[PDB]
Amino acid sequence: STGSATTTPIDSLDDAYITPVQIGTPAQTLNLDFDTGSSDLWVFSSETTASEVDGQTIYTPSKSTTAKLLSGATWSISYGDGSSSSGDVYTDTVSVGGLTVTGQAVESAKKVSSSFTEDSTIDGLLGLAFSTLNTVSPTQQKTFFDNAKASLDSPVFTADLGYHAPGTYNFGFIDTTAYTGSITYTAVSTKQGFWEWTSTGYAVGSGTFKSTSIDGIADTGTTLLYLPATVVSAYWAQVSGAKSSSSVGGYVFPCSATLPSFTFGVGSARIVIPGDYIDFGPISTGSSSCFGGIQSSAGIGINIFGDVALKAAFVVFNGATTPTLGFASK
Ligand SMILES: CNC(=O)[C@@H](C1CCCCC1)N1CCC[C@H]1C(=O)O
CATH class of the missing domain: 2.40.70.10 (Acid Proteases)
Known part of the structure; x- marks a missing residue:
């Protein structure tokens, strides 16, 4: 079926x-x-x-x-x-x-x-x-x-x-018509009960790719992308006027900004999140401050590849005896 x-x-x-x-x-x-x-x-x-x-x-x-x-x-x-x-x-x-x-x-x-x-x-x-x-x-x-x-x-x-x-x-x-190129599959750990995997690194905008292991979960039920504070600081440093606000509860940026893309690694493959995907709009109606779609995981205990990341890809949740996760561009 x-x-x-x-x-x-x-x-x-x-x-x-x-x-x-x-x-x-x-x-x-x-x-x-x-x-x-x-x-x-x-x-x-x-x-x-x-x-x-x-x-x-x-x-x-x-x-x-x-x-x-x-x-x-x-x-x-x-x-x-x-x-x-x-x-x-x-x-x-x-x-x-x-x-x-x-x-x-x-x-x-x-x-x-x-x-x-x-x-x-x-x-x-x-x-x-x-x-x-x-x-x-x-x-x-x-x-x-x-x-x-x-x-x-x-x-x-x-x-x-x-x-x-x-x-x-x-x-x-x-559905092989729903994505472009090939699907890259990557190992999954079920030890915490999540679709837990390890990204091979990241890039900010047109910047050089940083090879580094980032363990996290593929979570369709989480809106944003939560990553280590080092990674998140490197991203928002490329946006003039962006800052972390404890009063708001995360990174905000001027609504006048053009956001850079964010790339994450899946094995040797790369998924590019367009800048517009990282814009979650005025923090309150009419505000000139906008809420960022990439936030620190520091207070969570786990990195979360939520909708901001997943919507940039065609994602396969492979529930075979040895589960794996697949990502393709689309
Ligand atoms: C019309 N639906 C029901 O009566 C529900 C029952 C299910 C528990 C309470 C809510 C209604 N079932 C269907 C078969 C008969 C009965 C049961 O499980 O004993």
Whole structure:
């Protein structure tokens, strides 16, 4: 089998991407944030505290003839931005872009943090990291991808995120028309449960390439690119007036600037992030200060190749027995 679904930026800055997902019988379609940095599929639901729901579409298991309570199972998660959610668990039929999984754990939120409530466009998350990170207790559950894997033509999924435009998540096949040149594959460590890999270095604009190992994760659920402070300082030093602001919470730059590109290494190959991709707009409406798309990972504990990096590439998440990651230009 295969699946293919369009993913769409939630706003004009690509702050996140949502993908329609069919849950239950008859189908209930929710727009979920596909997140290769976590491993829970959770949704706003008929069980979510009323004051914490504001415009989201909810999953109502009582209206699904294929829903079953996963008795005694609960879940609780907190993400890197400090947001969180928790609740109980059902199993149900879940389809993405034509690909159907029966008995998928669908985690129903009873509580969500304010950042989720405040975002009316995201109805939940669909985790695509390794199932060892799944938070369901006392019986850990498999991701949608993990459940689908044996039935897929090939045990892979691909992320083709657009810049200020829709993109595509494919399951079970590689669309050779979706990228240019060849795909460079690189080793993955699953030791922390992430799609963790090592970049071979970087360049700023037209500068010389710096060969240096940068360990990080490929995370579709993170908006920006988080790299070591040395790397991030070297980038913003090429932008007149750019500075790190503790009050704002990262590097800002004059909205009048033309941003240089940023290149990262994948083996001997190079992925170029155009300068415009690194612009996340006025820090507040009308401000002449703009927020940068490359930020320091120093206070995170891990480097994160988020959407700013990934949208510059066609990315293959290879879930074979020995997992790997592939990057192509497009
Ligand atoms: C109409 N859907 C349901 O009644 C749900 C049930 C699931 C748990 C509570 C919400 C509704 N199932 C489908 C088969 C019968 C029943 C069950 O699991 O016992």
